[PDB]
């Protein structure tokens, strides 16, 4: 077995398949660099709950992925069990906190912030989950701008952070403990004929043969697979969501006991702080749909997240010293939802487009892979996110319409910006044209979601050209 | 007859112009104040009648507070029926007096937690400790409003039975009421009150003449301690009433709507606070800033207007900023110096005061006004009144230090209620900054009193010449008392 | 008759009036309008006699606009002798008709580059060409001015002898002058003017009287071609004249000091402007606010004064923040359709107008009352005024591309103005998807004439039907022409 | 011995090492330092060779400060040789030293009128009395920049051969020449340097090891009072050096674009400044914070970073906002206690010490190599830096009230910079509030020193503790030198 790609997936499916097939060799491909890399960017957060938008949870395919990452959290106290088992005391803790708390502000589209608060209030009555809202005066730690305070404030027990780089290094010491082999090259290239998969080609130029090879290699996944035939159209495009943290020396080297964050805002990006050990804090995270990769913060990115964190978590903040500033690609699928599972290459399998919230549901996700793997059927809920498809049309053309526009809005909202009165009734009126007229145009059957479209409007017409092109392809191809 | 007469023509001296000529056939009594209403409070309020939304933190924090707010409770009992007896003396062409029933106070993050998160928790627990109606709903399920996001509410509380009326229509509903009753309007103001051998006499009014009178009244707003300080001793005896200046506006809506409540938020900086009271004819109401003067001021600043707007078209509908400005009014809301109320008699014979009401008098009016009359009757009126007796040493109703953390943090919130936008460490620094200066004032203006904060700001930013006499008013009250 | 019936009783009308009864004193001159003036540009006006600081690039890129200009330079050489012919009718009592001498022009960047920098520029151009005295000096010499630092000017520019007037003062001063050369006014308005047989016989009143004449002269400011239209085929051979509504204010200063001369911006988004007039008293005039309305409106809407206040206290005098609001004035500037005055004679014999002047028809009054009173004795008034026939086709002064380019920069300019705080990206994109929208309107509206941006703003806000009528009234009017 | 150690690896010491090599062929020169660099300010330089740019009106007001531009001045005509010197040790594939020749001074209105518009007419003053060749230019003339509109300059100054170097390539440089020269480097830290009998024996390194020289020659930038003040008395002969912490970035730019020449504004609140430096490769350096700290820092400030990003991207050009960050730089600028460098010889033979340069250290680099390296040779160097030699009691170049002033008025400019939005009375309250906390910091320290308002800042927010230490170490220097 061959795993192509070394984040939270390529490492975690790698993790299982070494403990539960010691008959078989398996290798994992990718560089310490982690170029492009999500998972050693996020803070991060155990994220199911949190994650809840009225936008997703309003789609049958959105219910699915909030079902799926609702499971993930049963799994994480023995996994993290499991991987810290293999190490030391001197190894660090991978669990930074076991709560969240949901802030409520007005630093933001009441369309989006006031929908999602009651959302996330819905999903977990519903789920039974243990929770509560809270007075936001019995908030430990949080010292807001007066301006863009919370003024709600919600407890979800349970629902807590991991250290990333500690995971990414417990899941590596946990694979070779189990017998895995980490090759630090690349794939270049996947070899099959007669329908089934030989290997893969590595950027130093050698041959490794496999039965099966896994490619996990985050918003990099597609672009490998798309290069067999008949697969450029049948595997749905994975693009980059470039999204920016940082990690800071506290004032006093204080921190919250809890995660902190909002919803789910603009475009997919979102405020949050993640507890870490040894007076450092997790500070994130923006997102931007780019359709070639980024691996720099731009300095509006940089701006946005100190200025948010500053204002609405703590003061303090603005004090604290900066030690890093990280970016990562969160694989963002074209269709908005994962690709999980088998392909029409026997011994080929996929694990990505996980977007926001790959890292939770990766114990889960490897766990299903591996059953299919096994002749097992894995986990009930996950067929429809199988990465052979046509692109998935989870919404109506006038629903994301609505929603490209609502979230242009809220990047003014969440500046926060200060406008004459009228200007953003004009500014909604003259934005439904555009965004309508570029729909119309990609394609008659297929609409990108919001965060995409944005993308899409503000690209090059030979990039807009391209993707027409390419949605003609794949209705050719499934119709 | 004995005769009466009442000097001021604003909610209170009218109520109790009423009251008399209802209830004392044997009496005349002659009512003055003219129809400009220089300074009048009563024509520029909205008005609310509030109980529970001026409730705050602070007010409910002093004994006194709690004595003062229990009478605006009671008082909500008595309108109903007042005002069918009001509108009873007219017919369908003058209009209701009744605007709203209920009332909705708003939650948003344009104001210091310190006082907005603090009295929205101050306003539930005094509704739940009275068992009135009330519930806390959903800002989406708010009527009308449309606020800025950025400004817009994440909490709101309906308050049942809490309402409004229409001020103009109050007072010519009080003219008519005064009038079938047996009352006389004369549009003269007094210049002085005569009185030898501890009695009144009567007015000398501003065209020259001389009324007689065994009994006057006092109720001319701002006004009302100036007029009697004139009389011996009273100068040092009965608490200086300055000018609470407030600005509101008349607006004629975009579509001609309104609200089906009172909106509002709970008291801001220096009782000042965002309301909008509905009105008929497709005109609200907006209110009010408030700033006490030493000196009265009957027009608004430009700085009063701009906050004013600013603040209901950001945080209550943003269809206001297109709505046509009908009218800017200003009036003195009558600021007592010690912050309580002066209400019934003196040492004096006959003469008697209604005032120092500040942003409550026209809610309590028919309580205050059964209360004077029935003390003019020889009654005791209404139980807890007589702590707020117009002759007395000023009352202190907090400690100098619980004044001095009000006065810092009510600066602060004219900051955020803006709201400013200022580099993050500027506030804390603001703050312990402001600390040494008010400490310096209060040490230096009193050993033993200490003006409460509204008052205190307005003397931080007056004259050198101002606050010395001030010096010199406190140690002459201290020398008249002690 | 040999009667003149003169049809409004603004800056234009009793200036014309004072010309035709100081020129023929052997006919009657009946001057018709109410002391009430509705909707009245000239009491709103400050005002400035401006000629210098009323030039933009845009104005100064068209030959029309170039034509106009040299008439507010030739009006302004008229204005001492006028001014000294008017106070010679009073008393010292009446006051002085004129409040300063010279003009500051400042540049600050609480606005758009686009308009402020190209505007100043074209200032100073004018300013040479014309060899008029004038001095760019340091912003530290400009006395009394005390902006906020952030909205404060970094170039200052002196123009010699281009001063103001007290509007009302020279409003009285009209008057007085008129009655003193045996005119009559009749305080009524004009209903309709009755003409047969290819000439003016007089005016029916809104009292239901009929006054005959063998001259009628529209001076009715924006009401001016609504009147006129009634005749038979004028509703397409007289330009449409709609509502500049513009929002001044009275204010009295917090010392009772002012400047000793104008202080001005250049001309702002869609013809409004910040200005600050000197007035006697203690009082300054700030101003002023512009919107071309379809239909007149008489009160300012909330964000009219907000945006006037916020703009004087930030960028000329934080003094004025605590300075009381006196008066809110509103008026209606005469803006006509394809951005020219209507002035002069008629396809019917007696019938002429004065109007259209948008935003310095108080300026150029003594100019334009000359020219038509010289054209009434069959002169040939002043050169260049010929091109402003009151019955024409539509002016198009500038092209489609000009006007869109225009609309957008314009457009742009009120956040810029206001000022906003918004994301750096915002901005561009807001201009990328305005230009598609106006484009489309202009296209829309007719195949040959294109409203100036003042006006294409007011139309790409209206109702649908407001704009459909639009598209038939220019569909006549080319019909009639072509 | 006759051998020399220089002890510091960035501009100071291997411009003085250079120097010494290459005038004394026949001695052995030693220079100590690491390649990180700790908290070194030449990499962290972008940097301008900043002489008229760094004029301020309250540094040309002293003395001191008129002695210090005028070093400037006379540094500036050595960098032309200079870089030819340094170039000629290396081909053209090393990179060229100077990234721009001139240097463009731009005034916006983000910021204090009592500090930017006072600096910009220092500045032209400054240009004018050097005879220097300079020219205030059109805004729209200046190349490359797109500024928001609100942020816009309104005025801006070409200053023609005030340019920058890329500080890396002449740190490479300075090394290959030092080399060349026979220099060798050692790359350890200086731990203590040894003396006895009035006289320099060497230097223990931080490897253990001893060093034999006749001269040391002290440039360890913030370090260097630290490593001298162990020997006897100097702890209060040698004034104190602390950390001028400055941030600034490295930016590729969205088309690989970049300006011609320097882009700056005057030096700003607490010697903060604005300013862009011309890289090669699609580069450019922005820069740069400053913030005097009692201990080293080697990190930016989330504030820091947000307030040179949010400048740049409003104020040059708005297409930095889209721009790739590549690197958050940090450096400490040697500030010294009394507000002027530390230049020349000792008490003790053979001991110099190069420090305390500030914001100009690499500017003023060739020149005080020269001054040193002549002195060492028993010269009397450059005239006019005799006042700067380093065993000195602590200079008084202002008045406690100039500092009083000026602390108030920089802390009123970080407001305006930011740029806030407050009511408009809230400033003077402010100014009013800050002058007495100030005042009594200033009377606590000493009765006859102040600290410069950089560091009085520092001192005002610093712990009890460490303003104590400073009220000691004031006393030690009062009763060393008194
Ligand atoms: C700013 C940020 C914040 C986040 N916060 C959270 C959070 O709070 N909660 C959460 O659950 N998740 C979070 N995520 C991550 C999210 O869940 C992602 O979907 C998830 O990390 C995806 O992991 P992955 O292994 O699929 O991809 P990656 O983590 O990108 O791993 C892919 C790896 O494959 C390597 N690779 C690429 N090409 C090749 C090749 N040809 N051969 C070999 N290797 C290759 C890459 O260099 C990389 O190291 C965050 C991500 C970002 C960017
Ligand atoms: C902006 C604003 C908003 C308000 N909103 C509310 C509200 O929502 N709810 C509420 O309950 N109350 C409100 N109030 C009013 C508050 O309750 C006042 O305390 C109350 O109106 C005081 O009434 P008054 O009759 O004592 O004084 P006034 O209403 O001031 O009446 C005094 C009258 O006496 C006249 N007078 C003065 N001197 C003489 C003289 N020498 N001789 C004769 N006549 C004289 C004056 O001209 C005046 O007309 C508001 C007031 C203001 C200014």
Redesign the interface.
């Known amino acids: 077995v061959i795993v192509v790609g070394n984040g939270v997936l390529g490492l975690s499916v790698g993790v299982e398949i070494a403990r539960t097939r010691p008959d078989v060799r398996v290798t994992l491909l990718g560089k310490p660099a982690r170029q492009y890399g999500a998972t050693p960017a996020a803070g991060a957060m155990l994220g199911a709950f949190g994650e809840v938008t009225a936008h997703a949870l309003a789609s049958e395919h959105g219910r699915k992925k909030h079902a799926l990452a609702v499971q993930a959290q049963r799994l994480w106290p023995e996994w993290i069990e499991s991987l810290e088992a293999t190490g030391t005391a001197a190894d660090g803790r991978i669990k930074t906190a076991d709560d969240t708390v949901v802030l409520?502000?007005?630093?933001?589209?009441?369309?989006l912030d006031?929908a999602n608060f009651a959302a996330v209030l819905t999903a977990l009555k519903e789920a039974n989950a243990p929770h509560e809202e809270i007075a936001?005066?019995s908030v430990d730690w949080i010292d807001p701008?007066?301006?863009?305070?919370p003024?709600?404030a919600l407890h979800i027990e349970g629902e807590g952070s991991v250290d990333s780089g500690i995971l990414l290094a417990a899941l590596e010491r946990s694979f070779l403990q189990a017998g895995g082999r980490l090759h630090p090259v690349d794939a270049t290239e996947i070899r099959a004929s007669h329908g089934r998969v030989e290997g893969v080609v590595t950027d130093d130029g050698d041959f490794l043969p496999a039965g099966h090879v896994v490619v996990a290699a985050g918003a990099r996944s597609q672009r490998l697979v798309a290069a067999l035939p008949g697969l450029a159209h049948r595997i749905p495009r994975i693009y980059d969501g470039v999204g920016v943290s940082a990690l800071?020396?506290t004032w006093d080297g204080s921190g919250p006991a809890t995660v902190l964050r909002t919803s789910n805002r603009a475009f997919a990006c979102g405020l949050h702080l993640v507890p870490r050990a040894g007076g450092s804090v997790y500070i994130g995270a923006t997102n931007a749909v780019c359709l070639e990769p980024?691996g720099?913060?731009?300095?509006?990115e940089?701006?946005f997240l100190?200025?948010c964190?500053?204002?609405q978590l703590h003061?303090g903040?603005?004090?604290?010293?900066?030690?890093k500033?990280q970016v990562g690609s969160r694989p963002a699928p074209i269709d908005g939802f994962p690709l999980i599972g088998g392909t029409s290459v026997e011994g080929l399998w996929m694990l990505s487009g996980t977007y926001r919230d790959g890292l939770h549901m990766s114990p889960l996700l490897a766990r299903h892979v591996v059953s299919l793997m096994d002749g097992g059927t894995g986990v009930d809920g996950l067929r429809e996110f199988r990465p052979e498809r046509d692109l998935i049309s989870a919404w109506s053309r006038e629903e994301i319409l609505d929603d490209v526009v609502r979230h242009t809005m809220a990047?003014?909202?969440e500046?926060?910006?200060?406008?004459?009165?009228?200007?953003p009734h004009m500014?909604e009126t003259?934005?439904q044209?555009?965004f309508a007229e570029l729909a119309d145009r990609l394609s008659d059957t297929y609409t990108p979601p919001a965060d995409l479209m944005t993308a899409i409007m503000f690209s090059e017409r030979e990039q807009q050209d391209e993707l027409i092109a390419y949605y003609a392809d794949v209705h050719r191809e499934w119709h």
């Open positions: 409520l502000n007005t630093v933001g589209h009441s369309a006031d936001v005066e701008d007066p301006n863009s305070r003024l709600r800071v020396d980024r720099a913060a731009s300095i509006e940089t701006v100190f200025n964190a500053t204002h003061r903040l603005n004090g604290s010293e900066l030690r500033v990047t003014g909202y500046f926060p910006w200060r406008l004459p009165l009228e200007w500014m003259f934005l044209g555009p």
